[PDB]
Design a protein around this ligand. Structure first.
Ligand SMILES: N[C@@H](Cn1ccc(=O)n(Cc2ccc(C(=O)O)cc2)c1=O)C(=O)O
Length: 257
């Protein structure tokens, strides 16, 4: 009975509208939920979906150097596999094993629908409409490290803009976009942006192309006997369309706009 650690992040895994009535594994739903079923189907095992203990994805702690979130749960033997939007980064591929990407993304732009800007280039030149990123994360560092013209030029601005274009939480940013009446563009991972654009208050939208390329993968403990099977499962699901099928499912069918 494989112990699956995952996490609450819409539309990857969510609590059923009447979850308090359903029990066990049926209490949940979302892209990753469906995906877990396919993995397990194609792999031939029984599983128990468990929401990650401390609610984090996974990072080494500032002092302890010890892994937290799902990564940690995987490194220290608490769970057997992680099925969630876990971006495949070096730091993690050094301690746990990733399947091939099951979905992809990149830093994109979120503008309040109807906004003049349409690309990063369109922003870089601009000075009228402000814009920023989360205060700390993939996105924030990508720019303070990016040696590309269009991006270096952008870092400088956000770098010391006042008020600060940065935001403490990920929803807080989206909030500024809307309430800023158009004087604010947010840069966030393409997946979140897409979701939000299909949500109520349909007043935002993703614009331009992704400024980079990443991808989410399924994680298993180093030495796991599920490793090889899982990776092959992700490949087959992609080869039969099931993934796109799903991404389209939770972002559009379930979309509200
Ligand atoms: N990929 C992450 C996990 N994950 C998955 C889906 C999602 O919507 N978010 C939310 C999120 C997206 C972009 C930013 C940003 O950079 O402004 C901040 C928060 C998330 O953090 C993992 O690899 O750690």
């Amino acid at each position: 009975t494989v112990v699956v650690t995952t996490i609450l992040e819409s539309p990857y895994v969510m609590m059923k509208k009447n979850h308090e009535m359903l029990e066990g594994n049926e209490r949940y739903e979302g892209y990753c939920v469906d995906l877990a079923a396919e993995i397990a189907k194609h792999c031939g095992f029984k599983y128990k979906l468990t929401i990650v203990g401390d609610g984090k994805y996974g990072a080494r702690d500032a002092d302890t150097k010890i892994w937290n979130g799902m990564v940690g749960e995987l490194v220290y033997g608490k769970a057997d596999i992680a099925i969630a939007p876990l971006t495949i980064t070096l730091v993690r591929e050094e301690v746990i094993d990733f399947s091939k990407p099951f979905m992809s993304l990149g830093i994109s732009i979120m503008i309040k629908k109807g906004t003049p800007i349409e690309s990063a280039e369109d922003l870089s030149k601009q000075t009228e409409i402000a814009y920023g990123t989360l205060d700390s994360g993939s996105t924030k560092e990508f720019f303070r490290r990016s040696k590309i013209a269009v991006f270096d030029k952008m870092w400088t601005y956000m770098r010391s803009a006042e008020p600060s274009v940065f935001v403490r939480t990920t929803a807080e940013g989206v909030a500024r976009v809307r309430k800023s009446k158009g004087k604010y563009a947010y840069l966030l991972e393409s997946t979140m942006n897409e979701y939000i654009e299909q949500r109520k208050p349909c007043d935002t939208m993703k614009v331009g192309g992704n400024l980079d390329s990443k991808g989410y993968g399924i994680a298993t403990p180093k030495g796991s006997s599920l490793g090889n099977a899982v990776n092959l499962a992700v490949l087959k699901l992609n080869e039969q369309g099931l993934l796109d099928k799903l991404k389209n499912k939770w972002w559009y069918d379930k979309g509200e706009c």
